[PDB]
Design a binder for this molecule. Sequence first.
Ligand SMILES: [Cl-]
Ligand SMILES: [Cl-]
Lengths: 216, 216
Amino acid sequence: TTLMLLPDGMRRWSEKNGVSLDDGYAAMGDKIIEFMGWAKEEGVKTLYITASSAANHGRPEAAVNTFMEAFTEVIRRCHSQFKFDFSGSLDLVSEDYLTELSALRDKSDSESDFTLHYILGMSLSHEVVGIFNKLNGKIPEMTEEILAENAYVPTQVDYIIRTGGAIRMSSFFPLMSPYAELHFSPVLFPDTTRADFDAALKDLRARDRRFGGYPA
Amino acid sequence: TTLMLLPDGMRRWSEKNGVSLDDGYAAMGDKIIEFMGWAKEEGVKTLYITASSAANHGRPEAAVNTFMEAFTEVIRRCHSQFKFDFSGSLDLVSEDYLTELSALRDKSDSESDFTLHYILGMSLSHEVVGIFNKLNGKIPEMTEEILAENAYVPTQVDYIIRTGGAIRMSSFFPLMSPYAELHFSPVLFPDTTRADFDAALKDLRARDRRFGGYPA
Ligand SMILES: [Cl-]
Ligand SMILES: [Cl-]
């Protein structure tokens, strides 16, 4: 199973509890590690996590480093437990975070049958723009196969969990996975319990799935 | 307000009521006309309807003509009551139907405040592929503005209503509207009542909305 987690709710959890944004993101880091264990136990093989939108990288440098440091900490803690990978709008990410993440990809277990994959600077319009400008005037035509090899999410997504209560995709729709089953939880990400996750998976596993076929 | 309608449930409604798919598609036709009235009354100004996926046009000819004929009939019957437009994977649609729709756009009321706009052969991958190949080697670079002027859905979508109970986007996510608010209705589209529509709007209208800002 391939699962994509949209872990929304950090700021509002911090505000709710009267604690700093650094605390919220620390709680998010701990919850990601717990969630990863739950996913593993339920047979998820690939866990995509939307670390950021393209819009998030236009925030103040200080606030960018808050989330970046929190997402990187998770990988510093657990890179030996999985194959780590990342992609997205890498042009938006500071060199020092790109160097660290590359090192952590290299230090992670390429023989793990579990993949943890961060999407950074996610956004369809930014994604398409980027792919266009990389290949524009360079190749003779685009095909769905060439699109898929340049897409931020390199494989098909079976399920999406969005926490935090918004019922919208925001910047995080996977370009090449039209038939991903969507589960929206009202729980703020750092409050997610194992029962919230189990309810999500019970819903998702019972859906009448649809797979796509050959392009048009 | 801009509303996109994903009117799923025709095939299952016909099966449930023991009738032909032609009868399913005519009940859908009658209901689009009714829904359009309902949307006018609640302040909808542009109503996008997802008439087909790109995948829909790989079905056999007979099956294609059933849906193309039923959607085109709505517009034959009502074109004087709104401004009509259409877009999408026009490369997949037969010349006869493009000519007729093009005539119906012309004969519709271009001075109406209400737009009914059909998306044909919707699919992000096929969309992006098409936009790429149109513009490949033709411009020095893509920007968000240029993407937006070539996208199938030409304006921002505020709300999406998907009937028929699936909780997924299928081929139908609007490329340039990350923050479109999603409402999933379990009702099969030909059974949709005013009360279903009102509850959809009561939910969509109370959402905490978010808007996009300048690209990166
Ligand atoms: Cl959001
Ligand atoms: Cl579907």
